[PDB]
């Protein structure tokens, strides 16, 4: 993030991830079944990966823009690149 | 246990990332740290799995040098895949 | 596998994986799109994982049996364990 | 184009696995080798993505040291996640 607007959304998501980690401690200290925990942990990893893709997409786009290089073909390269990352970096 | 040890390290990573963001760090650094959170979610999953597996086979009243390896190799395999 | 029957099923699956690696090789010899290649590689990995579970499950089962220790609860534990491995080792 | 480099070495692992089985190796050893097949496929994926990412951002006629690093950093993540 470079824009203060991007700073805000990421902080939101990051906080929401601390929100998911709270419920995991809450569940760990309590009466949780390993299958419910593993699921909570998996959703943490899902959330991180979600955000990683959103930061990456945003970073790549800003790089091309500072370089006066943003066009529709560049923009779609990024679309293509992020679909792959979303699908294969887990 | 060794599990909460890891839940804190995760919380540790998220608060630093929350602060990286507050302290306006460079984008490479934000990505570096989100990837590291994911890596620790995998490491934590490798503990909780290791717990449930260790615990499920002591529970079955089958002790043996041979059964212990079988359970070490299962754990070694989990560790390879999740690190 | 210790059993001469289980050696055969596994050896099929391994060959079926060679068959997938040859199709992948065809697709790099000739030219298919870069997303169809990724999909092929993921399918190889899905096949390896798939077999890693089948072998793991059989190995654990044999260990309890060989120790005169096989019951239904031991059997369902292995069911519970493999379902997790299938779901979380990728 | 060092994709064949790896597709070969992966075929190398499958045949050794086929030998292990024909040659009555330990059940522990089969699992070790199947995990390494999976590990190789991930490495293969980390090359094929690297090919595509590089190829896709040179094709945009946008050169600059700052753009090169953004692409290095992308490729670093790809490597971190897959090995």
Author numbering:
A (entry chain C), C (entry chain D): 2 to 91
B (entry chain B), D (entry chain A): 9 to 91
Question: What did the study's authors say about this model?
Answer:
EcFrmR is a member of the CsoR/RcnR family of transcriptional repressors. Therefore, the in vivo and in vitro data showed that EcFrmR is a repressor of frmRAB expression that responds directly to formaldehyde by disassociation of the Pfrm–EcFrmR complex, allowing the expression of the formaldehyde detoxification system. Thus, like other members of the CsoR/RcnR family, EcFrmR is a homotetramer. In vivo and in vitro data show that EcFrmR senses formaldehyde directly, with no metal-dependence, via the formation of inter-subunit methylene bridges between adjacent Pro2 and Cys35 residues.
Like other members of the CsoR/RcnR family, EcFrmR oligomerizes to form a disc-like tetramer, constructed from two homodimers, each of which forms one face of the disc. Each subunit consists of three helices (α1, residues 2–30; α2, residues 35–68; and α3, residues 73–91), linked by two short loops (L1, residues 31–34; and L2, residues 69–72), that are arranged as a flattened S-shape. The formaldehyde-exposed EcFrmR tetramer is asymmetric. One face of the tetramer (A/B face) is comprised of an unmodified homodimer with electron density visible for residues Lys9-Lys91 of both polypeptides with a disordered N-terminal region (residues Pro2-Lys8). In contrast to the A/B face, clear electron density is present for residues Pro2-Lys8 of both subunits on the A′/B′ face, resulting in an ordered extension to the N-terminal region of α1. The Pro2′-N atom is located within ~2.5 Å of the Cys35-SG atom of the corresponding subunit on the opposite face of the tetramer. There is extra density between these two atomic positions, indicating the presence of the formaldehyde cross-link, and a methylene bridge (-CH2-), as indicated by the LC-MS data, has been modeled at this location. The crystal structure of EcFrmR reveals both the free and signal-triggered states of the protein. Whilst the position of α3 is similar on both faces of the tetramer, there is a translational movement of α1 and α2 on the A′/B′ face, which slide across the equivalent helices on the opposite face by ~1.5 α-helical turns in response to formation of the methylene bridge. In addition, the C-terminal half of α2 twists and buckles towards α3, which alters the packing of these two helices, generating a 10° off-parallel angle between α3 and α2. This movement changes the overall size and shape of the A′/B′ face, which expands and elongates by ~10 Å on the diagonal in response to formaldehyde (Animation S1).
